[PDB]
Amino acid sequence: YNIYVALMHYPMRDKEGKVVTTSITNMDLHDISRSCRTFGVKNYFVVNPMPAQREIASRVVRHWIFEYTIITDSLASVIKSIEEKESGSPIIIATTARYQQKAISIEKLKEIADRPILLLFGTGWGFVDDILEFADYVLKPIHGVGDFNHLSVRSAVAIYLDRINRSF
Amino acid sequence: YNIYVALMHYPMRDKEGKVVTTSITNMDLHDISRSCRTFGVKNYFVVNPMPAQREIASRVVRHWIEAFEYTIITDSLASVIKSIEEKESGSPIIIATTARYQQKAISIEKLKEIADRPILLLFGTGWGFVDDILEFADYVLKPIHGVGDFNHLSVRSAVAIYLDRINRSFQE
C-alpha cells in the first residue's frame, strides 16, 4: 500500500506539557523530504495551522527547487488530500518515543495494512496524548540500548522508513 | 563490542569530486549525538583539521549541554584512532560509509560476523569521502538503498539508520 508522511506542528506538548503550536524548522523540510523520496513515500505533508509558518515553509521549498512536499494547515486537510489521491481513507498511525501497550510493530503494520498508511510525526516535545489515543494505531517506539531514546524527528523518520523497507 | 562513530570533514568530495574541507554544521553535532546515545555508541568524534572549526564546535557542545566527555572534537582520524586504542587497549576495525556502491561492500549481517573487536564507523560530509578513504578502510558498508532512483540522505539520517540496523542485528 501507499505510504504518506506528515510532519505536524500542532498539537504538541511544551516542556510543561501544555499544548503548543511549533514553528517550522528549515531542515525538517529538506531532510525529511530526502528520506521520504529515498524510501518511496508518495507525498510529504508539512502541517502547521499558522499561516505565517506555512508561508515561510513555502518560500524555503520554492527556492530549494515539485508537487511532492505539500504544505497544509491541518491533519483534517491531510486526510482529505489522501482520499482524493487514493479514493480511500488512510490508516492513521502516530509515532512517539513513549510506551504504549497497544502499540504495534512494523511487521504487524505490514499484516494489518489493508489501505494507504499515513504516518504522523510530531515536533517540539511530541504529540499531546489525544493524538495517540485517537490514532488508528501507534507504532512501537524506536529504542536503543538504555532509557535514552530522544531522537530528532528527522532521525525517527529515517529509521521507521528504513524498517518499513526492510520488512517488505 | 564497543561501537564508535566519527563525523569527518576532510577529505570530502565536491559535486565534481575534487577534494574539499567542509565546515561543521551545528545540527550534525546535536542530532548525531542523540542517535549515538540512543544506540549505545561509546564516543562520538567530530573530526575537522581546521582549528577555527573545532573551536566553534566545542563552544556549541558546551552550550547545548557530566556527558561533556561523550562528544569528542578532534583534528584527524589518526587522533580518533589513538583515542580508541587508549580506551580499548586495541585497534578498532575501520568501516567507512557511502552512498556509492563498492563491489567489496559488506552488509550489516556480515559486519556482525567479522566484528571481533571495537568498531569505528566513519561518516562523511559534503558529497562523501574521496576514493582514498574507501580504499583505506578495513571494510565499507553497503549503501542505504530505498526505491532505486534516489538515495541522497543527510548524514544525520544515515547515522540513525545504520545504528538502528546494527542494534537490531544484535537482537535477531
Ligand SMILES: C[S@@+](CC[C@H](N)C(=O)[O-])C[C@H]1O[C@@H](n2cnc3c(N)ncnc32)[C@H](O)[C@@H]1O
Ligand atoms: C523531538 S521528538 C519529541 C519526543 C516525544 N517524547 C515523543 O512523543 O516522541 C519529535 C518527534 O520525533 C519522533 N520521535 C523522536 N524519538 C522517537 C522515538 N524514540 N521513537 C519514535 N518516534 C520518535 C516522534 O514523532 C516525535 O513526535
Ligand SMILES: C[S@@+](CC[C@H](N)C(=O)[O-])C[C@H]1O[C@@H](n2cnc3c(N)ncnc32)[C@H](O)[C@@H]1O
Ligand atoms: C550528504 S552525504 C554525501 C553523499 C555522497 N554521495 C556519499 O555518500 O559518498 C554525507 C554522508 O552521509 C552518509 N550517507 C548519505 N547517504 C547515504 C547512503 N545512502 N548510504 C550510506 N551512507 C550514506 C555517508 O556517510 C556520507 O559520507
